[PDB]
Each structure stands twice: as structure tokens, then as C-alpha cells.
Amino acid sequence: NRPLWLPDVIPPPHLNGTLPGDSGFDPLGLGLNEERLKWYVEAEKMNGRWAMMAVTGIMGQELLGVPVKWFEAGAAEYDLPVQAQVPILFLVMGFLETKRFQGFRETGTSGFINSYPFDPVGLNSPKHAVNEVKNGRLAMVAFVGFAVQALVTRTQPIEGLQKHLADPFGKNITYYLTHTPEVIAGT
């Protein structure tokens, strides 16, 4: 009854289909426990949301023409030094995550602060939840791709995209895995 995973029949015992974005992808069986299942649902949504905001920040920074690259953003001269974020960077997010955990103890969903539905505009539909989960998985794949661009290609993501459009055969995985690693180091 589900659009399912890979070609065709792979019936999941603990994934009936009521879960948002459920396709039966559990080849090794890690989510049999129900409490662990809902915790991993929430944690998948968390890494997906952070992947969303990470990748959108990356292409927004590249499209708006900032000089520093996203992988070299740590060591540059800014108005507040790196020693000055990590006090309140840790403090405010520790407060936020502690509030959200003490709310998740009894609610079982996400939420910013107190107002756990967190819907000023509403439109909370199961279709929106499935869209959130699947676009989140796409965001994780995209951020992994961006990190491996920074590692191997050592270039910006949209710059690598433009390289793929400009020379599709000559900027593939073979060129950037064999011809480049002696050249990119001091290119």
C-alpha cells in the first residue's frame, strides 16, 4: 500500500506505514523498541531540520557573495571573537534544548518554547509532515555532498555545480578523484 523502498517487496515488521515518511527502510533493524522509535523519529527530524538550515545558509552565503567560504568561516576577523560566542552560544542553546526536553517528556513532539504546537500560521497537515521528513533527508544528503565537496573538490557547492554544467565530462568523479588531488593542494 506504500510507495515503499528500492524496487519492490521488502515488508517491514515494525513499520506499518502510519509514521510520516515511512517507506520500510530498515535493512538492519535498529528501531524495534517503540520508545526508541519515537525518539529516533524526533532525532531524525532534528538532524533533518539542522541539515535544512545548514545547506540553505551555505547556498545563501555563496549566492549573496560573501568573501569567506563556508568551510573557512571559523578563522576570519569578525566583530565578536570565537572566544566570545561559545559562552552564550552554549548557554542559550542549552536553555532552549533543556526547555524542549522538559516539554518533550510529556508532549512527544517538537517545539520552540512553551507553545509546543508552535503554529502561528497553522497548516499542520500529515502531508506537510511527510514533506518535512523527505525534504529533510534530501537536506542530509545535500550537506554530506557539500562536506565531501569541501574535502575532495575543495571548492564552493554552487561553484562545483557550475563546474559540472560547464564541463560535464571532465569534472566528473574520475577527474576530481584522480587528476585533482596532486593539483588542488596549492591550485
Partner 1 sequence: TKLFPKFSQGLAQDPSTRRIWYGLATAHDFESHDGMTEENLYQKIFASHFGQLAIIFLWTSGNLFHVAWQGNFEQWVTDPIHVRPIAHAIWDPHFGQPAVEAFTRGGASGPVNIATSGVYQWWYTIGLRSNQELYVSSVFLALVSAVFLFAGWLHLQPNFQPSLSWFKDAESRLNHHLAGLFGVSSLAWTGHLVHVAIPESRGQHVGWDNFLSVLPHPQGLTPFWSGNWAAYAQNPDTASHAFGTADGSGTAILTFLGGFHPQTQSLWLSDMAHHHLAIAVLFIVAGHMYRTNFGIGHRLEAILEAHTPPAGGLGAGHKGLFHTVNNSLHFQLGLALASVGTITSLVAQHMYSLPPYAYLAVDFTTQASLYTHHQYIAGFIMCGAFAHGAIFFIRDYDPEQNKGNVLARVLDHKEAIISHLSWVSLFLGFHTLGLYVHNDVVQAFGTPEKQILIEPVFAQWIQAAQGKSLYGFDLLLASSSSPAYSAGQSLWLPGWLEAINNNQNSLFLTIGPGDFLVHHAIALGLHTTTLILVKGALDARGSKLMPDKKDFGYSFPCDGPGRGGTCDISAYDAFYLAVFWMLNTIGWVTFYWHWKHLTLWQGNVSQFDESSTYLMGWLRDYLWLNSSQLINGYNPFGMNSLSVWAWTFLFGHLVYATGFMFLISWRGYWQELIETLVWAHEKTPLANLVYWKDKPVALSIVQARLVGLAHFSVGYIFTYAAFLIASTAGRF
Partner 2 sequence: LIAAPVAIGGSTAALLALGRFVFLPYQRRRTDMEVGPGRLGPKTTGDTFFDRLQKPASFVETKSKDPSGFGLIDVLGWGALGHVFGYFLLACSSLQDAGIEPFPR
Partner 3 sequence: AGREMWYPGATPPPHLDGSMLGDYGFDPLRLGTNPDRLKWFREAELMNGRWAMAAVVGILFTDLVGLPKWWEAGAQTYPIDNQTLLIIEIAVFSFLESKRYEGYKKTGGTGFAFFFPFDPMGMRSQDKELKELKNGRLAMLAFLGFASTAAVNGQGPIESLQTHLADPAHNNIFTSSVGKESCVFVAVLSILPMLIEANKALGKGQESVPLFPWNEEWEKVA
Residues that bind ligand CLA (CB under 6 A): 3, 5-7, 23, 25, 53-54, 56-57, 60-61, 64, 66, 68, 73, 161, 164-165, 168-169, 172-174
Of 8, 35, 77, 106, which lies in the binding site for partner 1, with binding defined by CB under 8 A?
A: 35
C-alpha 127/C-alpha 160 separation (Å) is 33
| Grid coordinates of 91 | 548557554
C-alpha 87/C-alpha 81 separation (Å) is 11
C-alpha 61/C-alpha 66 separation (Å) is 6
- Which residue type occupies 182? E
Nearer to partner 1, 123 or 185 (CB): 185
Q: Rule CB under 8 A: say whether 66 interacts with partner 1.
A: no
Residue numbers 151-180 binding partner 1 by CB under 8 A: 151, 177-180
C-alpha 72/C-alpha 67 separation (Å) is 10
The residue ranges that bind partner 2 (CB under 8 A) are 7-13, 24, 26-30, 32-33, 36
